């Protein structure tokens, strides 16, 4: 399903506790003023929302004595359609929301060339029905999201006697040379 | 279909409150029903099937549970009515289901709850089939039940010194640590992974 | 508005609608291979075809009307039998190259055979073969793979504007392709790559390098051209594989250029991947971010306010240039360019001053267009495109400056200034063609305006605007647009960055990526230099100091597209090396050199730059502006003297125009193989 | 009767209903977007 | 005062549910632990301290005298987050 | 000849070419491409030729069908999974 | 040389669904719930036949 | 009047940004449609940045040497007391 909770669509404002916020209290006023308030799937503006790592992020089991780096990342959020060099794949695309996390570390050991992650994370991508399943997640994960939203190919009048078409009478002049 | 079946509509005669939805199909044997059942009722409803006649003659087979946070058909998404099962596991958390086999009926029933509280808390019932502690066990160490009145909470298949439920769908399987030997320590320790991709 | 019903369940269409159409919005899945949503109805392949009661014969989907009360059965054995029928007769031809076939795990053909064809075959006979034919180096043909399904000639045609591809011959030893041999050579020409469903027209530079089941794609914009056109990004490993375009319906419609398609392997070769110094012999050391840092930041601290410089490059984006300019700010530093001449003459003091008001799809909207050197073919081949469409559909094209093939039909109005001049005096016909014209619309190319008299010329065009109409509030139309050329540019406009305050003698210059028009006699000889870049083919050889930067594909950043949208470019791959991001750079120095920036993250970055403008927050939008009147109104007094020297364009070639598609091969060997051919001193009088 | 029935139900009810998709929607080219001027 | 610190991290809690399962699986490593269950060097790793060197060893201060007064942002530019061999 | 000039590269499918054929051994690993050179061309005398690449199906390669009507005539034309070439009988 | 039936047209794919309300709930319940009726209406005997053959 | 015929050597720029509808904004955006060619005619040279967003505040930034800012909010401020804002600001 793609199409279906107020609190899930709620963007919380932010409140600076940083010093270097707390110098730039006035963006982060702006910031709060001209983001949306609500998130919803049939939204137009794209927007970046910080982690909350307050009693809501409980829910993560990425926080363990050998890992520091997974809470507080940012995903992003956005629907992938199917690539532009094929129209009927046996498992079409475009019908979910990917969450993505960009990559961390990739290089090649050299004894054989073999093609090396420093982060296991962002290795796969998440896949949710509806965009507020994915917001609830990264609320409950204490995760930041970059929310885009899809572009879709307009409706066309489409037939094929447009193919012959009279081209007018032959006394019709084009006074634009 | 070419042999004797019945639905185990009893049950829900004897509790008198509870909505009942149960499915037959194809995919599963002829014998095979399945059923929707309420998570505050589950213990009461186990209570039932240990003793009453004609099902005190049961077994618990297999116990486990579904991440459908993250389930999405990927093809004929148009083939989809209001009477599918699977049309269950959308926008629900959290999966459990069992299955028993009643041998005076020779049935197979396989019961589901929808868990959707973020603790993902149910009652267990380890108490009444001795099956149940630790299939109950893996399940919860697997991904993140908790079992209230279990009659033993430990891990046991995981490894020691750690907390992680591998089976839901955020886990890489791969996960976050490798157990390596130090020299500097003459005893093996763990340390964040870096592993090779294909 | 009629009722019809597919498979049982009734649902409401419009009249206008095809059987095809009203089955895909009511989620139906009707497989096909010669109908394409842009191009011209088709029906020689027989794919579609469905079963109707009432009408014996199959009916193809693709190309009929719907009729009131209908039923499309989509699901009966008859619909399965028209299917498999149709399926043997493609593949009864069909060559065996699916190992091959570049197509491999993304052909149609394969994917619809096994989900509706019969599943095995009886065809025991000798199979056609055809010949392969050269079409260039961006396009390989295997052309026994052809269903001769016509996509490329209905693109070609419809789309590209070129008339080279056909159908040659007859029955089943019919040809596709030119008759002659004649290379493919056009912008967008990969596209029709995209466009084919089988393996008869491959990306020949990826060819044979990758499969489809072993890639992950990304989404983000393109910076080769000032529009920002939304693109995928496929890479295995640390390696970028290809590039595809997107869906935006805005901006490039469905399809990229050649340069952004292809130019992206520019990043894989004369890589700047740690800090450098160079000596006074000129040999280059490799060193530490410390003592690099450490030696700026002393530069910094002795250098006079006034002999600080700096240039702001093509590749620069917002938070870079934000970065820069607290940083010279907090070292009482004002100006940010040191060339001479090329600088933009207008004034970042209102948005509408230098941005497209009337958006990317204004070309449709006008009725009349004219361009000011300005040279669309070059410098926008998805709006060049766009532009052919609406001229198709009653748009006049006129053009003032050098005489350009583009593959639609425009008059000339002129070649050097005297005809803006005659125009703005008035005594011309132009300006009644312009007052009779319902939406008129100038494009000024951004280069006309570098000219020592840019700001003559801009006036001019201001006072032609007013007094003809292309601003009207009667109409609610803003008709005057500037096609930039840099995106760096672009965005120090938004930000607030004067491009006309330029220090004319400055020891320390901060060269934040410029390699475009950049000369020794620009930088003084006894001077101080750091270039900020990715790559060595310029500025790195004027540098003291070289730091190594990320690329567009390499950071988190947020882009202005030459209209005015705010998008966002998302890493795909760290930057190589020891290479660092521009204000990260920019930050580090600053705190090293005793005046550091209130900003540790890309978010208390993105405050500073709400509190600059708002606006550049929202992302994939353009921000209204109220004050374009204000803007662009008429000064009295303002000098209007133009000098009498021919208007021209800034692009020789195509292939090559900065340091990513410099340092690129399939680039050179596309200009060895299509410069010598698309040279030409005199008009195409066909089109 | 016990107090979560009403939950159970309600979770029961949201479950089976139409699942529409956001592709497959028909989606028109808008107007041209007026320019507005100040005064 | 190191696995005080683990639980003043783990502060924020608010779901009994979730602080019952906290609570039992707590219960079950410290039996592993006085059971010699589990290795020494593998459930050090909750006794160790956050910001201060083991006793049991020398340590290195070569990167505070460096990067003395230098903020966070600095220590982390000096020092990259990937080789750079590749 | 240069094998960066426009006419090398243009009868070489736009790629940089290499007459000696050693350069193989390091980038491909192997001396498949002087073996394959040492083959002479096959003279076939109808316009069309059956590769299989061996004396059975199954040993070899799936059937392929190329065409020696070309617009030059006697052009020879390599199968595409065995190095083999062919061409029309005079 | 025939092919055309080498797949199957019938499979083991079909499933029955069975939805049942409460065994306790008496009618007026059911009819209350499936907004039929309302509370106050209750105990009346034209509320309840009205509501049953809107119901039926 | 004198004190926008010369902008002071400390004055850098003068940065404004409001809201396009929003009556919050009201006085500031008549301020900046009705005076800005009068102070850019005297100031031919000095930059007078104007950016709007949808729900912005009011805002008068004023810059000064070696990178120092100073932000007024200029919420519900009618054509006076504008003037006196900017006038004040253009003149420490
Ligand atoms: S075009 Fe290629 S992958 Fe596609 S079926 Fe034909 S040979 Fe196979
Ligand atoms: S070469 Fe390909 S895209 Fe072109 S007509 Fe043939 S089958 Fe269609
Ligand atoms: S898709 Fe309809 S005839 Fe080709
Ligand atoms: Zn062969």
Same mark, same amino acid.
């Given at each position: 399903?793609?199409?279906?909770?107020?609190?899930?669509?709620?963007?919380?404002?932010?409140?600076?506790?940083?010093?270097?916020?707390?110098?730039?209290?006035?963006?982060?006023?702006?910031?709060?003023?001209?983001?949306?308030?609500?998130?919803?799937?049939?939204?137009?503006?794209?927007?970046?929302?910080?982690?909350?790592?307050?009693?809501?992020?409980?829910?993560?089991?990425?926080?363990?004595?050998?890992?520091?780096?997974?809470?507080?990342?940012?995903?992003?959020?956005?629907?992938?359609?199917?690539?532009?060099?094929?129209?009927?794949?046996?498992?079409?695309?475009?019908?979910?929301?990917?969450?993505?996390?960009?990559?961390?570390?990739?290089?090649?050991?050299?004894?054989?060339?073999?093609?090396?992650?420093?982060?296991?994370?962002?290795?796969?991508?998440?896949?949710?029905?509806?965009?507020?399943?994915?917001?609830?997640?990264?609320?409950?994960?204490?995760?930041?999201?970059?929310?885009?939203?899809?572009?879709?190919?307009?409706?066309?009048?489409?037939?094929?006697?447009?193919?012959?078409?009279?081209?007018?009478?032959?006394?019709?002049?084009?006074?634009?040379? | 279909?070419?042999?004797?079946?019945?639905?185990?509509?009893?049950?829900?005669?004897?509790?008198?409150?509870?909505?009942?939805?149960?499915?037959?199909?194809?995919?599963?044997?002829?014998?095979?029903?399945?059923?929707?059942?309420?998570?505050?009722?589950?213990?009461?409803?186990?209570?039932?099937?240990?003793?009453?006649?004609?099902?005190?003659?049961?077994?618990?087979?297999?116990?486990?549970?579904?991440?459908?946070?993250?389930?999405?058909?990927? +093809?004929?998404?148009?083939? !989809? %009515?209001?009477?599918? /099962? #699977? @049309?269950?596991?959308? $926008?629900?958390?959290?999966?459990?289901?069992?299955?028993?086999?009643?041998?005076?009926?020779?049935?197979?029933?396989?019961?589901?709850?929808?868990?959707?509280?973020?603790?993902?808390?149910?009652?267990?019932?380890?108490?009444?089939?001795?099956?149940?502690?630790?299939?109950?066990?893996?399940?919860?160490?697997?991904?993140?039940?908790?079992?209230?009145?279990?009659?033993? +909470?430990?891990?046991?298949? !995981? %490894?020691?010194?750690? /907390? #992680? @439920?591998?089976?839901? $769908?955020?886990?890489?399987?791969?996960?976050?640590?490798?157990?390596?030997?130090?020299?500097?320590?003459?005893?093996?320790?763990?340390?964040?992974?870096?592993?090779?991709?294909? | 508005?009629?009722?019809?019903?597919?498979?049982?369940?009734?649902?409401?269409?419009?009249?206008?609608?095809?059987?095809?159409?009203?089955?895909?919005?009511?989620?139906?899945?009707?497989?096909?291979?010669?109908?394409?949503?842009?191009?011209?109805?088709?029906?020689?392949?027989?794919?579609?075809?469905?079963?109707?009661?009432?009408?014996?014969?199959?009916?193809?989907?693709?190309?009929?009307?719907?009729?009131?009360?209908?039923?499309?059965?989509?699901?009966?054995?008859?619909?399965?039998?028209?299917?498999?029928?149709?399926?043997?007769?493609?593949?009864?031809?069909?060559?065996?190259?699916?190992?091959?076939?570049?197509?491999?795990?993304?052909?149609?053909?394969?994917?619809?055979?096994?989900?509706?064809?019969?599943?095995?075959?009886?065809?025991?006979?000798?199979?056609?073969?055809?010949?392969?034919?050269?079409?260039?180096?961006?396009?390989?043909?295997?052309?026994?793979?052809?269903?001769?399904?016509?996509?490329?000639?209905?693109?070609?045609?419809?789309?590209?504007?070129?008339?080279?591809?056909?159908?040659?011959?007859?029955?089943?030893?019919?040809?596709?392709?030119?008759?002659?041999?004649?290379?493919?050579?056009?912008?967008?020409?990969?596209?029709?790559?995209?466009?084919?469903?089988?393996?008869?027209?491959?990306?020949?530079?990826?060819?044979?390098?990758?499969?489809?089941?072993?890639?992950?794609?990304?989404?983000?914009?393109?910076?080769?051209?000032?529009?920002?056109?939304?693109?995928?990004?496929?890479?295995?490993?640390?390696?970028?594989?290809?590039?595809?375009?997107?869906?935006?319906?805005?901006?490039?419609?469905?399809?990229?250029?050649?340069?952004?398609?292809?130019?992206?392997?520019?990043?894989?070769?004369?890589?700047?991947?740690?800090?450098?110094?160079?000596?006074?012999?000129?040999?280059?050391?490799?060193?530490?971010?410390?003592?690099?840092?450490?030696?700026?930041?002393?530069?910094?601290?002795?250098?006079?306010?006034?002999?600080?410089?700096?240039?702001?490059?093509?590749?620069?984006?917002?938070?870079?240039?934000?970065?820069?300019?607290?940083?010279?700010?907090?070292?009482?530093?004002?100006?940010?360019?040191?060339?001479?001449?090329?600088?933009?003459?207008?004034?970042?003091?209102?948005?509408?001053?230098?941005?497209?008001?009337?958006?990317?799809?204004?070309?449709?909207?006008?009725?009349?267009?004219?361009?000011?050197?300005?040279?669309?073919?070059?410098?926008?081949?998805?709006?060049?495109?766009?532009?052919?469409?609406?001229?198709?559909?009653?748009?006049?094209?006129?053009?003032?400056?050098?005489?350009?093939?583009?593959?639609?039909?425009?008059?000339?109005?002129?070649?050097?200034?005297?005809?803006?001049?005659?125009?703005?005096?008035?005594?011309?016909?132009?300006?009644?063609?312009?007052?009779?014209?319902?939406?008129?619309?100038?494009?000024?190319?951004?280069?006309?305006?570098?000219?020592?008299?840019?700001?003559?010329?801009?006036?001019?065009?201001?006072?032609?605007?007013?007094?003809?109409?292309?601003?009207?509030?009667?109409?609610?139309?803003?008709?005057?647009?500037?096609?930039?050329?840099?995106?760096?540019?672009?965005?120090?406009?938004?930000?607030?960055?004067?491009?006309?305050?330029?220090?004319?003698?400055?020891?320390?210059?901060?060269?934040?990526?410029?390699?475009?028009?950049?000369?020794?006699?620009?930088?003084?000889?006894?001077?101080?230099?750091?270039?900020?870049?990715?790559?060595?083919?310029?500025?790195?050889?004027?540098?003291?100091?070289?730091?190594?930067?990320?690329?567009?594909?390499?950071?988190?950043?947020?882009?202005?597209?030459?209209?005015?949208?705010?998008?966002?470019?998302?890493?795909?791959?760290?930057?190589?090396?020891?290479?660092?991001?521009?204000?990260?750079?920019?930050?580090?120095?600053?705190?090293?050199?005793?005046?550091?920036?209130?900003?540790?993250?890309?978010?208390?970055?993105?405050?500073?730059?709400?509190?600059?403008?708002?606006?550049?927050?929202?992302?994939?939008?353009?921000?209204?502006?109220?004050?374009?009147?204000?803007?662009?109104?008429?000064?009295?007094?303002?000098?209007?003297?133009?000098?009498?020297?021919?208007?021209?364009?800034?692009?020789?070639?195509?292939?090559?125009?900065?340091?990513?598609?410099?340092?690129?091969?399939?680039?050179?060997?596309?200009?060895?193989?299509?410069?010598?051919?698309?040279?030409?001193?005199?008009?195409?009088?066909?089109? | 009767?016990?107090?979560?029935?009403?939950?159970?139900?309600?979770?029961?009810?949201?479950?089976?209903?139409?699942?529409?998709?956001?592709?497959?929607?028909?989606?028109?080219?808008?107007?041209?977007?007026?320019?507005?001027?100040?005064? | 005062?190191?696995?005080?610190?683990?639980?003043?991290?783990?502060?924020?809690?608010?779901?009994?549910?979730?602080?019952?399962?906290?609570?039992?699986?707590?219960?079950?490593?410290?039996?592993?632990?006085?059971?010699?269950?589990?290795?020494?060097?593998?459930?050090?790793?909750?006794?160790?301290?956050?910001?201060?060197?083991?006793?049991?060893?020398?340590?290195?201060?070569?990167?505070?005298?460096?990067?003395?007064?230098?903020?966070?942002?600095?220590?982390?530019?000096?020092?990259?987050?990937?080789?750079?061999?590749? | 000849?240069?094998?960066?000039?426009?006419?090398?590269?243009?009868?070489?499918?736009?790629?940089?070419?290499?007459?000696?054929?050693?350069?193989?051994?390091?980038?491909?690993?192997?001396?498949?491409?002087?073996?394959?050179?040492?083959?002479?061309?096959?003279?076939?005398?109808?316009?069309?030729?059956?590769?299989?690449?061996?004396?059975?199906?199954?040993?070899?390669?799936?059937?392929?069908?190329?065409?020696?009507?070309?617009?030059?005539?006697?052009?020879?034309?390599?199968?595409?999974?065995?190095?083999?070439?062919?061409?029309?009988?005079? | 040389?025939?092919?055309?039936?080498?797949?199957?047209?019938?499979?083991?794919?079909?499933?029955?669904?069975?939805?049942?309300?409460?065994?306790?709930?008496?009618?007026?319940?059911?009819?209350?719930?499936?907004?039929?009726?309302?509370?106050?209406?209750?105990?009346?005997?034209?509320?309840?036949?009205?509501?049953?053959?809107?119901?039926? | 009047?004198?004190?926008?015929?010369?902008?002071?050597?400390?004055?850098?720029?003068?940065?404004?940004?409001?809201?396009?509808?929003?009556?919050?904004?009201?006085?500031?955006?008549?301020?900046?449609?009705?005076?800005?060619?009068?102070?850019?005619?005297?100031?031919?040279?000095?930059?007078?940045?104007?950016?709007?967003?949808?729900?912005?505040?009011?805002?008068?930034?004023?810059?000064?040497?070696?990178?120092?800012?100073?932000?007024?909010?200029?919420?519900?401020?009618?054509?006076?007391?504008?003037?006196?804002?900017?006038?004040?600001?253009?003149?420490?």
């Amino acid at each position: 399903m793609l199409l279906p909770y107020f609190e899930i669509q709620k963007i919380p404002a932010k409140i600076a506790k940083t010093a270097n916020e707390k110098i730039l209290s006035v963006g982060v006023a702006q910031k709060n003023n001209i983001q949306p308030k609500t998130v919803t799937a049939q939204g137009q503006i794209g927007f970046v929302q910080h982690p909350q790592l307050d009693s809501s992020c409980q829910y993560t089991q990425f926080y363990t004595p050998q890992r520091r780096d997974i809470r507080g990342r940012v995903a992003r959020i956005y629907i992938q359609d199917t690539n532009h060099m094929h129209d009927t794949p046996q498992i079409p695309e475009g019908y979910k929301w990917t969450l993505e996390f960009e990559r961390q570390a990739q290089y090649k050991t050299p004894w054989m060339g073999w093609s090396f992650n420093g982060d296991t994370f962002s290795k796969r991508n998440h896949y949710f029905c509806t965009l507020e399943d994915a917001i609830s997640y990264c609320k409950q994960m204490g995760f930041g999201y970059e929310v885009s939203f899809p572009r879709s190919r307009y409706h066309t009048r489409k037939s094929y006697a447009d193919n012959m078409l009279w081209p007018g009478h032959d006394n019709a002049v084009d006074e634009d040379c | 279909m070419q042999n004797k079946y019945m639905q185990p509509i009893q049950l829900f005669i004897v509790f008198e409150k509870l909505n009942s939805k149960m499915w037959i199909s194809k995919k599963l044997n002829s014998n095979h029903s399945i059923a929707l059942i309420p998570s505050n009722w589950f213990y009461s409803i186990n209570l039932f099937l240990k003793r009453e006649l004609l099902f005190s003659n049961i077994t618990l087979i297999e116990n486990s549970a579904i991440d459908t946070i993250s389930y999405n058909l990927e +093809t004929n998404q148009n083939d !989809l %009515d209001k009477t599918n /099962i #699977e @049309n269950y596991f959308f $926008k629900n958390k959290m999966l459990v289901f069992y299955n028993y086999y009643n041998y005076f009926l020779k049935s197979k029933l396989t019961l589901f709850i929808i868990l959707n509280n973020l603790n993902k808390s149910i009652d267990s019932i380890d108490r009444i089939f001795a099956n149940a502690n630790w299939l109950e066990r893996e399940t919860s160490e697997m991904y993140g039940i908790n079992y209230k009145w279990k009659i033993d +909470t430990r891990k046991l298949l !995981l %490894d020691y010194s750690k /907390i #992680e @439920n591998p089976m839901l $769908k955020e886990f890489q399987s791969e996960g976050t640590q490798d157990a390596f030997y130090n020299i500097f320590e003459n005893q093996v320790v763990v340390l964040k992974n870096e592993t090779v991709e294909l | 508005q009629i009722e019809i019903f597919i498979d049982g369940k009734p649902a409401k269409v419009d009249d206008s609608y095809t059987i095809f159409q009203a089955c895909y919005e009511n989620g139906v899945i009707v497989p096909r291979f010669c109908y394409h949503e842009r191009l011209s109805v088709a029906g020689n392949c027989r794919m579609c075809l469905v079963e109707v009661e009432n009408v014996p014969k199959p009916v193809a989907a693709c190309a009929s009307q719907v009729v009131p009360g209908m039923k499309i059965k989509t699901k009966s054995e008859k619909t399965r039998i028209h299917r498999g029928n149709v399926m043997e007769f493609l593949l009864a031809n069909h060559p065996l190259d699916c190992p091959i076939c570049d197509q491999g795990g993304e052909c149609d053909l394969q994917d619809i055979s096994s989900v509706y064809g019969y599943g095995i075959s009886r065809y025991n006979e000798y199979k056609r073969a055809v010949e392969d034919k050269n079409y260039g180096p961006l396009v390989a043909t295997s052309m026994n793979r052809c269903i001769h399904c016509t996509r490329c000639v209905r693109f070609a045609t419809q789309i590209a504007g070129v008339e080279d591809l056909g159908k040659t011959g007859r029955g089943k030893a019919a040809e596709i392709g030119t008759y002659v041999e004649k290379t493919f050579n056009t912008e967008l020409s990969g596209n029709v790559v995209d466009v084919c469903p089988v393996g008869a027209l491959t990306n020949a530079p990826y060819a044979f390098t990758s499969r489809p089941w072993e890639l992950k794609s990304f989404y983000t914009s393109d910076v080769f051209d000032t529009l920002g056109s939304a693109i995928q990004v496929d890479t295995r490993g640390p390696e970028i594989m290809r590039v595809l375009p997107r869906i935006h319906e805005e901006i490039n419609e469905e399809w990229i250029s050649d340069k952004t398609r292809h130019a992206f392997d520019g990043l894989k070769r004369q890589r700047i991947n740690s800090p450098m110094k160079r000596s006074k012999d000129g040999n280059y050391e490799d060193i530490f971010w410390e003592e690099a840092i450490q030696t700026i930041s002393k530069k910094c601290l002795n250098t006079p306010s006034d002999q600080i410089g700096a240039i702001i490059g093509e590749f620069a984006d917002i938070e870079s240039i934000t970065a820069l300019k607290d940083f010279l700010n907090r070292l009482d530093v004002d100006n940010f360019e040191v060339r001479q001449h090329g600088n933009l003459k207008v004034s970042p003091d209102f948005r509408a001053n230098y941005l497209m008001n009337s958006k990317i799809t204004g070309v449709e909207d006008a009725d009349v267009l004219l361009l000011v050197g300005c040279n669309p073919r070059y410098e926008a081949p998805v709006l060049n495109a766009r532009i052919l469409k609406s001229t198709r559909k009653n748009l006049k094209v006129f053009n003032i400056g050098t005489n350009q093939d583009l593959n639609y039909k425009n008059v000339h109005l002129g070649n050097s200034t005297k005809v803006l001049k005659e125009i703005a005096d008035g005594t011309h016909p132009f300006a009644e063609r312009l007052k009779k014209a319902k939406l008129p619309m100038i494009m000024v190319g951004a280069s006309a305006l570098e000219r020592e008299d840019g700001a003559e010329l801009y006036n001019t065009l201001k006072v032609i605007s007013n007094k003809t109409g292309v601003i009207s509030e009667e109409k609610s139309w803003n008709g005057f647009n500037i096609l930039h050329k840099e995106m760096g540019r672009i965005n120090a406009l938004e930000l607030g960055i004067n491009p006309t305050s330029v220090n004319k003698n400055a020891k320390l210059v901060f060269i934040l990526g410029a390699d475009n028009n950049l000369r020794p006699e620009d930088i003084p000889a006894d001077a101080f230099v750091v270039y900020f870049g990715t790559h060595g083919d310029e500025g790195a050889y004027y540098a003291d100091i070289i730091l190594p930067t990320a690329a567009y594909t390499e950071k988190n950043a947020t882009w202005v597209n030459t209209e005015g949208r705010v998008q966002q470019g998302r890493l795909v791959v760290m930057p190589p090396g020891d290479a660092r991001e521009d204000w990260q750079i920019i930050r580090a120095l600053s705190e090293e050199a005793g005046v550091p920036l209130p900003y540790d993250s890309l978010e208390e970055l993105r405050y500073r730059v709400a509190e600059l403008a708002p606006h550049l927050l929202k992302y994939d939008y353009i921000e209204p502006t109220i004050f374009g009147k204000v803007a662009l109104s008429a000064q009295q007094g303002v000098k209007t003297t133009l000098s009498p020297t021919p208007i021209t364009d800034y692009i020789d070639n195509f292939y090559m125009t900065d340091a990513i598609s410099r340092a690129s091969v399939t680039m050179a060997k596309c200009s060895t193989a299509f410069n010598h051919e698309k040279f030409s001193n005199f008009k195409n009088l066909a089109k | 009767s016990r107090p979560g029935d009403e939950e159970q139900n309600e979770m029961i009810r949201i479950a089976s209903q139409k699942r529409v998709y956001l592709k497959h929607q028909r989606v028109d080219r808008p107007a041209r977007q007026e320019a507005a001027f100040i005064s | 005062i190191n696995f005080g610190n683990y639980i003043r991290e783990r502060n924020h809690y608010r779901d009994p549910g979730l602080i019952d399962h906290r609570i039992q699986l707590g219960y079950e490593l410290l039996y592993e632990a006085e059971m010699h269950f589990s290795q020494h060097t593998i459930l050090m790793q909750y006794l160790s301290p956050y910001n201060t060197p083991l006793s049991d060893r020398g340590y290195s201060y070569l990167e505070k005298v460096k990067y003395g007064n230098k903020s966070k942002f600095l220590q982390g530019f000096y020092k990259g987050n990937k080789p750079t061999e590749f | 000849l240069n094998p960066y000039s426009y006419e090398a590269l243009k009868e070489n499918h736009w790629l940089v070419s290499d007459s000696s054929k050693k350069n193989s051994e390091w980038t491909h690993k192997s001396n498949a491409e002087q073996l394959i050179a040492k083959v002479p061309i096959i003279y076939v005398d109808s316009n069309i030729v059956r590769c299989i690449g061996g004396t059975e199906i199954n040993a070899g390669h799936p059937q392929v069908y190329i065409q020696l009507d070309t617009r030059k005539h006697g052009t020879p034309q390599t199968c595409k999974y065995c190095g083999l070439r062919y061409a029309k009988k005079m | 040389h025939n092919i055309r039936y080498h797949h199957e047209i019938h499979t083991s794919d079909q499933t029955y669904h069975s939805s049942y309300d409460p065994v306790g709930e008496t009618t007026t319940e059911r009819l209350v719930r499936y907004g039929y009726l309302n509370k106050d209406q209750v105990n009346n005997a034209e509320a309840v036949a009205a509501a049953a053959k809107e119901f039926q | 009047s004198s004190w926008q015929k010369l902008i002071g050597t400390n004055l850098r720029e003068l940065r404004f940004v409001f809201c396009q509808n929003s009556q919050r904004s009201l006085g500031l955006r008549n301020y900046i449609a009705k005076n800005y060619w009068n102070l850019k005619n005297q100031n031919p040279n000095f930059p007078l940045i104007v950016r709007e967003c949808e729900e912005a505040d009011p805002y008068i930034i004023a810059r000064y040497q070696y990178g120092v800012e100073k932000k007024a909010f200029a919420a519900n401020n009618n054509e006076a007391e504008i003037e006196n804002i900017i006038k004040t600001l253009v003149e420490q």
